[PDB]
């Protein structure tokens, strides 16, 4: 499923991402935008045997298991396929866990490059949520 910006904003708010560990809603919306363009089925193969899955492109080397990645750590203890669902529940739970490490949202390079230290509220500014 390809979310509408505001549609996803409301979804992420519903799933408690706004102000989660000091990160306003916009941060997550921005990251979703640059990572997958709000597409839950987005996937990306990497040079190692890993793959990034979902609306937030979570890597199978450390966060999820796809039964076909060498040196998998499966920190989110979740099948990577769960991160491709139209229901963002799984991707959100894993995201919340990733950001709970010492480096927070800095885990997402795209967030640092195009969201970190910017007026992220712009992303939700305009939605009636």
């Amino acid at each position, epitope marked *: 499923k390809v979310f509408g910006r505001c549609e996803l904003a409301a979804a992420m*708010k*519903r*799933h*408690g*991402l*706004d*102000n*989660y*560990r*000091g990160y306003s809603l916009g941060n997550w919306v921005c990251a979703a935008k640059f990572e997958s363009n709000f597409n839950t089925q987005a996937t990306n193969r990497n040079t190692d045997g890993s793959t990034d899955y979902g609306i937030l492109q979570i890597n199978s080397r*450390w966060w999820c298991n796809d039964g076909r990645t060498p040196g998998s*750590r*499966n*920190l989110c*203890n979740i099948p990577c396929s769960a991160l491709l669902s139209s229901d963002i*529940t799984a991707s959100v*739970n894993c995201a*919340k*866990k990733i950001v*709970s*490490d*010492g*480096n927070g949202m800095n885990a997402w390079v795209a967030w640092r490059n195009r969201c970190k230290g910017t007026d992220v509220q712009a992303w939700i500014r305009g939605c009636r949520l």
Partner: antibody
Amino acid sequence: EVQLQESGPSLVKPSQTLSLTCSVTGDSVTSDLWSWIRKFPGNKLEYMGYISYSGSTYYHPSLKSRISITRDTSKNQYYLQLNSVTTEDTATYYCASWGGDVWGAGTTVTVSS
Amino acid sequence: MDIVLTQSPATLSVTPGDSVSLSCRASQSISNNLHWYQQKSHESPRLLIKYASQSISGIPSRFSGSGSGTDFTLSINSVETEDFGMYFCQQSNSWPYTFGGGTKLEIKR
């Protein structure tokens, strides 16, 4: 199936250091974030802090000064160190996964002279 | 300021077969970042509901959670004999994580 077990001195004297060990079996200590939670008398729970998969940590502010959480990857265990204890540190200590899906049996540590 | 979770009633006596609702209130909005735990005497805490209403595979279906923001509720559809003990809520929205004072589910006679 991942399992946890707390071990360490059951008695610590005032002003000394409290040390506890959590042994991770079934999986690697590097496969999750792990925490230390204590229960004071009167059913009062306190989330002392946690250590990530990377080794970084977060400590409860009320403890940020006396607490330190470390891990040993070759042994699959992580530890809790709490300095300058007083009788108020007497409690049941538990180690658990960050997700709260796994918990040790917990171990009582009493601070007394 | 650390988030304070207030649970009520502190204690609740019911007859097995009856249904009950347990309240947990947060001093600040925490969206859906509220988790429910059960702890029976001499046993370690067990996670029942995560993120306000998400079910945990392996937990009896009589247990369910609802609420959002600052008001949460743990519901037990027809309490069973092995369900008595302590119930605590915990927020993970902000560090430090904090627990509510707990509600004691006891047997009515």
